[PDB]
């Protein structure tokens with residue numbers, strides 16, 4: 232990816248634009264993401280603890296939304312839609328997110344990522360080296376028309392994929408950490424692949 236050129240991806244749920252930028256704006260708190268590459272060369276992705284569809288429903292059922300929730304969330308909704316409800320369609324859905332979190336503008340991007348990666352990983356991830364390229368990710372969700380922005384950098388970590396296979400049940404942020412290639416059927420797979428490919432190629 233070249234400085235300030237933008238690439239656009241569409242999924243059934245989102246329109247996302249990905250653009251290389253020089254500096255993250257520091258007028259407000261922002262969100263920063265890590266494209267994390269394990270020591271054995273696998274790209275990592277997190278499964279968000281709560282799905283975006285369920286969070287949207289809570290903050291406000293369309294059946295397109297029932298295709299994009301976790302099964303425990305669905306059971307909570309169906310217990311209310313059907314009286315003696317004992318099961319419902321399970322879409323085998325996971326809400327894929329890059330690891331990372333909030334950057335106020337006290338801290339460097341690097342200290343922020345080290346901290347958030349260690350909290351989201353139950354203190355297992357440590358960063359061997361960072362990349363130098365920052366990508367701005369702008370998503371517009373199609374169902375609720377909300378716009379969300381975050382900034383992504385490469386993190387080459389010390390741990391192997393296998394090191395990160397289990398995640399504590401008390402992890403408030405993510406249900407698990409996995410390889411992105413274990414998510415090929417997810418509708419975010421194309422643009423997440425692009426992010427990793429661009430950040431790794433820039434590193435090389």
Ligand SMILES: COc1ccc(CCNc2nc(N3CCc4cc(OC)c(OC)cc4C3)c3cc(OC)c(OC)cc3n2)cc1OC
Nearest residue numbers: 244245283284286287290291328329370372374375377379
């Ligand atoms: C209508 O009412 C609401 C609705 C939602 C919400 C949740 C807002 N929080 C939030 N939203 C995000 N988006 C954008 C993407 C997206 C995608 C969807 O499908 C794929 C989607 O399907 C429905 C909704 C969203 C909202 C985020 C995106 C991220 O990209 C990586 C991220 O990184 C960690 C964190 C994000 N956090 C609050 C509402 O009430 C105020």
Ligand code: NA
Nearest residue numbers: 301302303324
């Ligand atoms: Na589930």
Ligand code: NA
Nearest residue numbers: 418419420421
């Ligand atoms: Na995809």
